[PDB]
Amino acid sequence: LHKEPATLIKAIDGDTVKLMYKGQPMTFRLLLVDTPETKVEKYGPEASAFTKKMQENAKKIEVEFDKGQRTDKYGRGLAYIYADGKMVNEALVRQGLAKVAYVYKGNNTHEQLLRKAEAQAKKEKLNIWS
Predict the structure, then answer these.
(1) For the domain 1-130, what is the CATH code?
(2) For residue 73, what are the contacts with CB-CB under 8 A and spacing of at least 6?
(3) Residue 89 burial class via C-beta count within 10 angstroms: exposed 0-12, middle 13-18, buried 19 and up
(4) Where does the chain bind Ca(2+)?
(5) Domain residue limits, the chain
(6) Distance CA 71, CA 29 (A)
(7) Phi (first) and psi of residue 71, to 5 degrees
(8) Active site residue 70
């Protein structure tokens, strides 16, 4: 897998973000994570504030497509998003602000890594795991 440059256009919520990718606006759905809904589940707004702050404060944003399908049915890019080298998908799970979701169409490169972060948050009874 390889990281490609991107520019934050707009944070949308925990599991979605709008980026300028290859010079065109595009909406991305973070791979392997399930964040609470804000439109308003519990920790829904926390998850959203988390990704917004992480993405807006980042100097560099990068998108990393997995080896499976790259877009969902709604035209959203399916990727791991990095902010200054740190994966937003992982940070979310680690902070207990998202659960690891089912593998989708062969996109599972980082499934174990997120599985680990999630076990740790659970053990720490962090947020959603409170």
Answers:
(1) 2.40.50.90
(2) none
(3) buried
(4) 15, 34-35
(5) 1-130
(6) 9
(7) -140, 145
(8) no
Resolution attained, angstroms = 2.1
Distance CA 37, CA 41 (A): 5
Question: Does the annotation flag 35 for ligand binding?
Answer: yes
Nearest to 34 by CA among 125, 96, 121: 96
Catalytic annotation present for 94: no
Query: Which structural technique was applied?
Result: X-ray
Please pick, among 62, 64, 76, 90, the residue that the annotation labels catalytic.
Answer: 76
Q: Which long-range contacts (CB under 8 A, 24 or more apart) does 89-92 make?
A: 89/30, 89/31, 89/32, 89/33, 89/114, 90/114, 90/117, 91/50, 91/54, 92/14, 92/30, 92/33, 92/35, 92/47, 92/50, 92/51
